[PDB]
C-alpha cells in the first residue's frame, strides 16, 4: 500500500510512467491496435502472448517482473448506452481486483472508452467516474495519463474538488 493513497494526473505517453504497473486500454483480441494500446505494444510486446480477454475485464500479464494489466473497455459504436455504461463500469472494477491481487504501490491508468472506443462522444466524467468508483477502495497510489490539455485541466479540476 502507498503511505496515503492519492489520485494525480499527468498529460504524457503511458508508455514512459513512473509507476509498479500499466492499465493497457486493451482490446478483446490481444491485437496491438491503435493510440495507447500501440504505444503500450512498443515498450511491452511481451505483455501480449494471450491477451485477449472479453470486454469488460482485465487480463494481467508479465513483461517480465513489470505487470501490464490489458482492461477491455466497451466501444460505444456496437454497445447501447446502457450496456456500454454496465461493460464501462466493470472493466474499471477487474482493473481495481488485479491491482490488489499484484500488491503493487502505483499503476497508471488511462480513461477507458475515451478515444477510438467513444462512439464519437465526450466520455470524460463518465469514465473517470468509474475509475474512481472502483479505485477508491484500493491502496495504491493511482496516476491517469491524457494527451489533451483541456482533458488534463477537468481531471486535475475533478480530482481536487473530492479534497
Ligand atoms: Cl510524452
Ligand atoms: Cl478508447
Ligand atoms: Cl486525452
Not at 503511458?14 to 509498479?20: H, L
Not at 493510440?35 to 501480449?48: D, L, M, N, T
Not at 491491482?99 to 470524460?124: H, M
Not at 469514465?127 to 494527451?147: E, G, K, P
Amino acid at each position: 500500500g502507498a503511505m496515503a493513497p492519492s489520485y494525480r494526473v499527468k498529460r504524457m505517453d503511458i508508455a514512459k510512467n513512473d509507476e509498479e504497473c500499466v492499465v493497457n486500454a486493451a482490446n478483446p483480441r490481444g491485437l496491438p491496435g491503435d493510440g495507447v494500446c500501440k504505444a503500450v505494444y512498443k515498450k511491452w510486446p511481451e505483455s501480449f502472448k494471450n491477451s485477449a480477454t472479453p470486454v469488460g475485464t482485465a487480463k494481467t500479464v508479465m513483461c517480465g517482473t513489470y505487470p501490464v494489466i490489458h482492461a477491455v473497455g466497451p466501444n460505444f459504436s456496437n454497445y447501447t448506452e446502457s450496456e456500454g455504461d454496465r461493460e464501462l463500469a466493470a472493466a474499471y472494477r477487474e482493473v481495481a481486483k488485479e491491482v490488489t491481487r499484484l500488491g503493487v504501490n502505483s499503476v497508471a491508468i488511462p480513461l477507458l472508452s475515451t478515444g477510438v472506443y467513444s462512439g464519437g462522444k465526450d466520455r470524460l466524467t463518465q469514465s473517470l467516474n468509474h475509475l474512481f468508483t472502483a479505485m477508491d477502495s484500493t491502496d495504491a497510489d493511482v496516476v491517469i495519463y491524457c494527451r489533451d490539455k483541456e482533458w488534463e485541466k477537468k481531471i486535475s479540476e475533478a480530482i481536487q474538488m473530492r479534497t
